């Protein structure tokens, strides 16, 4: 049954075995209808915790590559060994991105009807193109950024239908700014988009915020940390 697959996903998550969680989620993605809220969150959790370690690794390997490069007598072999090892990870990242990006385009985005879903999936789309754009350079990058920007702009248009303090609406704005700052290098443009989103949450802070208090109040805090980080530069 569905609920048993949900239970299995939750068990995989409980055990921190995400690679399987991806599969036990796909098995529910095969089933009828749109994914639930609970079922959506699990999807994001699985894929985030799969891509995360590789993203972390990529950065360390990248720092070590630069560190190795920047020396009086660069060892030619170690740069080779490192390059290949980065490129081994980049592939895992590519595969993990294509896997989900495919399912968003083919399965999830067309199936959706309510807004909160549409914004969740369109945000997600943005995120994985953004993760692809972290290691790409030059022109591949430019085309990926294009694919992100449209997903984020799709998410953004529809997010206007959600309350200012919806964790999806905030979560979006947070990531959309990060996209601008980190991929497109537009500090003003990211600050605008963050600040604008934060302030709208502050106006609606008094306004009912209830079960989203944990999830919203966090993202509000993250927007600020970013705003402080980017302002001071």
């Amino acid at each position: 049954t569905r609920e048993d697959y949900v239970f299995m996903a939750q068990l995989n998550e409980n055990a921190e075995r995400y690679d399987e969680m991806v599969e036990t989620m796909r098995k529910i993605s095969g089933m009828e209808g749109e994914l639930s809220d609970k079922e959506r969150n699990l999807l994001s959790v699985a894929y985030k915790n799969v891509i995360g370690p590789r993203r972390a690794a990529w950065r360390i390997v990248s720092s070590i590559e630069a560190k190795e490069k920047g020396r009086q007598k660069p060892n030619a072999k170690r740069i080779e060994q490192i390059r290949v090892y980065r490129q081994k990870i980049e592939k895992e990242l590519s595969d993990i991105c294509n896997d989900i990006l495919k399912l968003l385009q083919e399965q999830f985005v067309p199936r959706s009807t309510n807004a909160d879903a549409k914004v969740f999936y369109y945000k997600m789309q943005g995120d994985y193109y953004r993760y692809l754009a972290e290691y790409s350079s030059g022109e591949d990058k430019e085309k990926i950024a294009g694919s992100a920007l449209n997903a984020y702009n799709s998410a953004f248009e529809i997010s206007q239908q959600l309350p200012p303090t919806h964790p999806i609406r905030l979560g979006l704005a947070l990531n959309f700014s990060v996209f601008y700052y980190e991929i497109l290098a537009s500090p003003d443009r990211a600050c605008e988009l963050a600040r604008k989103a934060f302030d709208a949450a502050i106006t609606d802070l008094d306004k009912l915020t209830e079960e989203s208090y944990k999830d919203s109040t966090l993202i509000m805090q993250l927007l600020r940390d970013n705003l402080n980080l980017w302002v001071t530069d």
Binding site: D127, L170, L172, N175, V178, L218, L222, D225
Partner: peptide
Amino acid sequence: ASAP
């Protein structure tokens, strides 16, 4: 950071 980005959203959880």
